[PDB]
Design a binder for this molecule. Structure first.
Ligand SMILES: Nc1nc2c(ncn2[C@@H]2O[C@H](COP(=O)(O)OP(=O)(O)O)[C@@H](O)[C@H]2O)c(=O)[nH]1
Ligand SMILES: [Ca+2]
Length: 308
């Protein structure tokens, strides 16, 4: 009697739906996508299999005009349609940009419904750029607080961090793809975790233990080869140029290491030690290992960190 967890990614509002579209385009098998929006013009362009227009009575098919109360009411009045789209999910990722009306107000409602539908619920949300002004920032902050109350775990990406990773000419869309990778690689790492029986096996119950009712989280992946591969991959997995919540202070970690037949005991300890030393806490680890003999010299380290 084997379990295969159902993973769903739900985009709420404009930025959430664009993250969903870009993830579908990148190719994401075994994951189901849901697009929720007030804005019918955008929703018509969604690539998601399941689309939910919310608030048509309130907005006549427009967005929420920067009013989070409208996003909140829209979501509440579509509760049954949202439940029906979620039903059967074991894990739901809710992604949205905070600061506008639809994401700010509707994403916390979506997350609350998912947790009520029984799903392990993870939010991955942005804060606005400082150039969008103090009022947008204050509205987003209220959204982040409401998300935190509604989810099991929350990953916040301040959009100002994108300014740290661009040069003067990096296209805006390229920058946005960098933020999208936080969610996409997190989801893919859980998917890969569930699909394979590891030599030291982790499964969805381990994901639930590390993520349920925890608050802030980090989810990261690193890949390296050659000398010092395990240390390099571990450092990449915990590196957080875009993240509000770094690895520092983590008290619980799920770490999975995947390598080929050459994967050494010593280098697995080295990777585990990198993570614990960066947390600078006594970390409760849940450690796994997968041998994929297709891999020659590459090692992959996946981390989920909570307990902040
Ligand atoms: N990183 C990122 N930020 C986005 C993107 N789209 C919108 N944003 C941010 O999300 C906030 C809300 O925008 P949007 O989602 O369109 O608002 P809503 O649909 O009215 O809720 C904006 O103020 C931006 O900071 C996106 O594709 N990527
Ligand atoms: Ca497994």
């Amino acid at each position: 009697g084997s379990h295969m967890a159902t993973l769903k990614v739900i985009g709420v509002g404009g930025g959430g739906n664009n993250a969903v579209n870009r993830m579908i385009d990148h190719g994401m098998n075994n994951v189901e996508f849901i697009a929720i929006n007030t804005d019918g013009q955008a929703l018509n362009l969604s690539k998601a299999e399941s689309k939910i227009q919310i608030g048509e009575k309130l907005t006549r098919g427009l967005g929420a005009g920067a009013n989070p109360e409208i996003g909140k009411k829209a979501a509440e009045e579509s509760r049954e349609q949202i439940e029906d789209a979620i039903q059967g999910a074991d894990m739901v990722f809710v992604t949205s940009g905070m600061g506008g009306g639809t994401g700010t107000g509707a994403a916390p409602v979506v997350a609350k419904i998912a947790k009520e539908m029984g799903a392990l619920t993870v939010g991955v949300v942005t804060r606005p750029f400082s150039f969008e002004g103090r009022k947008r920032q204050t509205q987003a902050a209220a959204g982040v607080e409401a998300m935190k109350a509604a989810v099991d775990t929350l990953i916040v990406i301040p959009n100002d961090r994108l300014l740290d990773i661009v040069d003067k000419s990096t296209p805006m869309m390229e920058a946005f793809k960098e933020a999208d990778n936080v969610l996409r690689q997190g989801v893919q790492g859980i998917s890969d975790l569930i699909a394979v029986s590891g030599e030291v096996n982790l499964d969805f119950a381990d994901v639930k233990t590390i993520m349920s009712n925890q608050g802030s989280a980090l989810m990261g992946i690193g890949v390296s080869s050659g000398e010092n591969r395990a240390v390099e991959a571990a450092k990449k997995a915990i590196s957080s140029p875009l993240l509000e919540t770094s690895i520092v202070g983590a008290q619980g970690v799920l770490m999975n290491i995947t390598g080929g037949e050459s994967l050494s005991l010593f280098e697995a300890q080295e990777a585990a030690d990198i993570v614990q030393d960066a947390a600078d806490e006594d970390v409760n680890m849940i450690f796994g290992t997968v041998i994929n003999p297709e891999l020659q010299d590459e090692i992959v380290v996946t981390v989920i960190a909570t307990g902040f």
